[PDB]
Structure 1
Amino acid sequence: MNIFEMLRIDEGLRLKIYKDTEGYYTIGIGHLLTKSPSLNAAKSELDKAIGRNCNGVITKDEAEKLFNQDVDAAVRGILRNAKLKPVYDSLDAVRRCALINMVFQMGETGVAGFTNSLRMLQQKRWDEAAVNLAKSRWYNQTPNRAKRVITTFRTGRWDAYKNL
């Protein structure tokens, strides 16, 4: 298992513009297009993103291309972030995937806000950090996914994703 396979389990693949758990316009493998309520604003962002007139629909190929860019940007954002970098560097390869997953879902900013859990992950207090991460809007709004990510940080293994 790797970051791509992991995210693809969590996000799914949809070739037609769709709405987020949050109600936001998205396409592909969890590629948010706009937080704006117009399908029209979304379509426009889509065409801008792909470089063609898509009419709200993309190919598998275009979905994977957007996915590769998004993953690359998530990693690079972690590496550029003063709060995230040190945690990332401290972690093993599997746990690094769990932090990447959070950044992809919620953005650098959002994750950098989990001050206390970050501190615990740096200290390698796995059980404590898993309890602290669960105390969040994130866990309450998308519990099955948060639970997979959390198990990943707790164990350092891919068990949560075996089932799936």
Structure 2
Amino acid sequence: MNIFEMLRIDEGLRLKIYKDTEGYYTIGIGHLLTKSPSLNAAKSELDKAIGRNTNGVITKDEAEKLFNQDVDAAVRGILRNAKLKPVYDSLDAVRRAALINMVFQMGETGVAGFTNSLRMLQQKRWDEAAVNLAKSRWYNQTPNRAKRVITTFRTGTWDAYK
């Protein structure tokens, strides 16, 4: 297992524009297109991302390319964030993938706001972070996925994904 496989499991893969769990237009492997409620707007952003007139539909290769860019962007985000980088740097490889998962889903900003949880992960108080991580809208809205990522931080193994 790795970060790519991990996210592919959590996000799925859809080749036509669809709405995510929040009702926002997305395509591929969890690539958010826009928070706007306009399909046209989403189509415009899709064509801009791909470089062609897609008519709201992409190929598998194209989805994977977006996915690679998004993963990449998520790591750099972390590395560039003052709150995140130290945590990330203190963790083992497995747990780092869980932190990337969160940032891909919620953005750097939203994750950087889990202050208490961040501090517990940094301190290696696994069970404690896991309880504090569950006290969140994230957990209440997407409990199964949140469960898998939390288990990941708690155990440092890929057990939740196997």
TM-score scaled by structure 2? Answer: 1.00
Deviation at 1:66, TM superposition (A): 0.1
Q: Which residue in 2 is equivalent to 1:122?
A: 122
Deviation at 1:158, TM superposition (A): 0.3
Deviation at 1:105, TM superposition (A): 0.1
CA distance in 1, matches of 2:21, 2:117: 24
CA distance in 2, matches of 1:77, 1:38: 28
1:37 match: secondary structure: coil
1:130-149 CA deviation, whole Å, 9 max, x = no partner? 00000000000000000000
Percent of pairs with identical residues: 98
CA distance in 1, matches of 2:84, 2:134: 19
Is 1:157 aligned to 2:157, yes or no? yes
Q: Which residue in 2 is equivalent to 1:70?
A: 70
Deviation at 1:30, TM superposition (A): 0.1
Aligned length: 162
CA distance in 2, matches of 1:140, 1:77: 25
Deviation at 1:42, TM superposition (A): 0.2
1:34-79 CA deviation, whole Å, 9 max, x = no partner? 0000100000000000000000000000000000000000000000
CA distance in 1, matches of 2:71, 2:37: 26
Deviation at 1:31, TM superposition (A): 0.1
2:108 match: secondary structure: helix
CA distance in 1, matches of 2:27, 2:43: 10
TM-score scaled by structure 1? Answer: 0.99
CA distance in 2, matches of 1:55, 1:134: 39
Deviation at 1:26, TM superposition (A): 0.1
Q: Which residue in 1 is equivalent to 2:107?
A: 107
Regions of 4+ moved over 2 Å: none
Deviation at 1:91, TM superposition (A): 0.0
Deviation at 1:83, TM superposition (A): 0.1
CA distance in 2, matches of 1:36, 1:122: 36
Deviation at 1:5, TM superposition (A): 0.1
CA distance in 2, matches of 1:5, 1:113: 26
Contiguous gaps of at least 5 residues in structure 2: none
- Please give the root-mean-square deviation of Cα atoms over the aligned residues, in Å: 0.2
CA distance in 1, matches of 2:148, 2:79: 24
1:22 match: secondary structure: coil
